[PDB]
Amino acid sequence: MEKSVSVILLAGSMPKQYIPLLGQPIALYSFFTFSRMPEVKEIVVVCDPFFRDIFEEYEESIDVDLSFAIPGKERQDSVYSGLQEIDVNSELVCIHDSARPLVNTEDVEKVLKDGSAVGAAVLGVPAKATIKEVNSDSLVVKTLDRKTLWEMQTPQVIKPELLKKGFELVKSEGLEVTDDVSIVEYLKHPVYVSQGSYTNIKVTTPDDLLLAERILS
Amino acid sequence: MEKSVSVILLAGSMPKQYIPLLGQPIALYSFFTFSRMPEVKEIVVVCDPFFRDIFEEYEESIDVDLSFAIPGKERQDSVYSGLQEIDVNSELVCIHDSARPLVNTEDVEKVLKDGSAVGAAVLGVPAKATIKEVNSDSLVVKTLDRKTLWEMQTPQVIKPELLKKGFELVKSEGLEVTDDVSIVEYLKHPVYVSQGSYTNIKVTTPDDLLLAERILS
Ligand SMILES: N#Cc1cnn2c(O)c(Cc3ccccc3)c(Cl)nc12
Ligand SMILES: N#Cc1cnn2c(O)c(Cc3ccccc3)c(Cl)nc12
Ligand SMILES: [Cu+2]
Ligand SMILES: [Cu+2]
Ligand SMILES: [Cu+2]
Ligand SMILES: [Cu+2]
Ligand SMILES: [Cu+2]
Ligand SMILES: [Cu+2]
Ligand SMILES: [Mg+2]
Ligand SMILES: [Mg+2]
Ligand code: NA
Ligand code: NA
Ligand SMILES: [Zn+2]
Ligand SMILES: [Zn+2]
Numbered sequence: 001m002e003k004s005v006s007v008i009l010l011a012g013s014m015p016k017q018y019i020p021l022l023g024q025p026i027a028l029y030s031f032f033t034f035s036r037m038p039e040v041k042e043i044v045v046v047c048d049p050f051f052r053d054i055f056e057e058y059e060e061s062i063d064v065d066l067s068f069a070i071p072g073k074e075r076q077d078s079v080y081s082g083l084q085e086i087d088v089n090s091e092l093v094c095i096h097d098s099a100r101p102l103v104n105t106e107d108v109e110k111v112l113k114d115g116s117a118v119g120a121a122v123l124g125v126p127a128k129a130t131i132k133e134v135n136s137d138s139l140v141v142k143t144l145d146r147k148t149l150w151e152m153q154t155p156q157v158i159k160p161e162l163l164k165k166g167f168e169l170v171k172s173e174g175l176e177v178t179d180d181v182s183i184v185e186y187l188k189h190p191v192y193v194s195q196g197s198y199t200n201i202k203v204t205t206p207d208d209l210l211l212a213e214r215i216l217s
Numbered sequence: 218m219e220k221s222v223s224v225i226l227l228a229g230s231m232p233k234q235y236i237p238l239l240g241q242p243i244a245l246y247s248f249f250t251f252s253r254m255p256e257v258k259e260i261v262v263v264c265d266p267f268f269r270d271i272f273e274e275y276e277e278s279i280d281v282d283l284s285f286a287i288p289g290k291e292r293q294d295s296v297y298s299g300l301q302e303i304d305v306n307s308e309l310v311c312i313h314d315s316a317r318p319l320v321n322t323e324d325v326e327k328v329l330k331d332g333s334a335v336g337a338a339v340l341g342v343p344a345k346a347t348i349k350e351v352n353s354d355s356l357v358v359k360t361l362d363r364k365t366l367w368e369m370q371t372p373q374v375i376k377p378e379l380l381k382k383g384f385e386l387v388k389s390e391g392l393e394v395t396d397d398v399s400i401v402e403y404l405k406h407p408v409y410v411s412q413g414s415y416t417n418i419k420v421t422t423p424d425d426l427l428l429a430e431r432i433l434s
Contacts, residue, residue, distance in 0.1 A: 122357075124349075124351065130368070130369040130397040130398060131344055131366050131368055131369070132341075132366065132369060132398065132410075133366055134341065134366075134410045138409055138411075139407050139409060139410070140339075140398065140401075140407075140409075142398075142408070143402065144403070146396075147396075148350065148351055149349065149350055149351075149366075150348065150351045151348055152346065152349060178363040179363075180347040181349065181357065184357075185357075185359040185360065186361070191356060191357040191359070192355055192356060192357075193349075193355050194355075207424075207428045210424065211424045
């Protein structure tokens with residue numbers, strides 16, 4: 001389990017993931033969280049060359065190998081680029097959106113374990129809002145059961161062979177990728193939802209930055 | 218269409234819906250929005266007696282009738298209580314969560330029209346997060362299509378007879394009510410989703426209060 005995990009850290013005015021929270025660019029919070037975990041062998045940072053120095057500065061202080069990959073056009077392209085740089089025998093890849101700086105170590109632990117066990121897992125929390133499918137006539141698609149919808153977060157943790165098979169399938173068949181689990185949806189392999197924390201927010205808007213400071217205290 | 222609509226305004230440290238935004242308790246923002254609409258004949262405010270004065274102070278300045286109902290145990294109970302106080306021939310009831318102070322008049326207009334036309338409508342916005350059903354083994358219930366999930370907001374607009382039939386059914390059959398459209402889900406009558414605005418937030422946490430000020434400018 002030690003040094004078995006490769007992290008792909010998605011990090012591609014300043015883009016939101018480089019703005020500081022308490023003086024430290026957002027992307028560094030999750031970077032340091034992962035670096036400290038004995039399970040994590042390497043972090044492949046997917047970022048524009050311009051920002052490489054933000055991470056390279058801490059290279060000799062961290063207990064992981066630091067690598068880079070070039071971002072792609074869409075998120076899944078950035079995932080793929082990162083994937084080409086991971087260690088040839090990492091048992092798991094841990095993909096994380098750098099705009100989620102508050103991910104707790106204990107939650108990363110949990111999703112790593114679940115991904116190892118199941119093959120694929122993702123941190124999720126129950127959706128608090130009422131959420132429904134709406135059809136092409138703008139009508140609610142009704143359901144009769146208390147139904148339980150979950151909001152996916154990151155990390156998304158997967159055996160690299162499984163992820164590679166997913167990309168192979170989507171490219172070979174020309175399949176649509178429209179949300180953050182579309183690739184694994186095309187496979188028959190199960191995907192576990194590890195229960196996360198509502199504090200694991202994504203910083204998308206400058207109002208988020210204030211919520212993120214509020215949480216850090 | 219003039220004076221055809223009854224609003225049920227759900228308004229049951231200070232509870233969040235009574236905290237000020239720019240000096241005015243949150244619940245008053247949507248109250249005033251509705252009051253100004255010529256379609257709106259009455260607002261039945263569902264609130265603890267303690268807070269009645271917050272609304273009664275403006276009674277002679279507003280061009281609607283102001284009535285009160287006692288809150289119930291759960292949200293649907295508060296809806297029912299309000300429903301017993303609306304005008305005997307309102308053509309539509311417009312149920313609104315007072316913690317949504319930023320609802321725009323043009324959006325209320327839209328959902329009123331759609332509710333009149335269809336019988337039942339609710340303001341919604343596309344969910345930006347990846348959201349999935351999760352089964353009892355904590356696995357993702359996969360879907361193969363680009364799927365479109367919407368977050369419901371308020372107003373929820375409905376012909377009162379339809380709503381009364383929904384309550385009659387749920388009480389007579391002992392049916393579970395677990396989200397904000399459960400009652401209409403038991404009926405066969407269609408429910409329209411009117412496209413709202415991402416600014417129509419619900420103030421649930423004190424960080425919301427800052428987002429709400431930010432939006433008001
Ligand atoms: N962008 C993007 C994207 C679209 N689908 N997809 C996906 O299935 C995985 C792999 C995965 C999914 C769930 C749990 C673990 C791993 C990842 Cl990491 N990214 C994506
Ligand atoms: N609390 C609560 C609650 C549970 N179900 N339900 C419902 O179906 C309606 C009516 C309605 C639904 C959609 C569109 C318009 C009206 C309303 Cl107003 N409240 C609720
Ligand atoms: Cu190195
Ligand atoms: Cu190495
Ligand atoms: Cu946010
Ligand atoms: Cu009156
Ligand atoms: Cu009257
Ligand atoms: Cu919020
Ligand atoms: Mg398999
Ligand atoms: Mg009907
Ligand atoms: Na440099
Ligand atoms: Na009084
Ligand atoms: Zn550990
Ligand atoms: Zn009008």
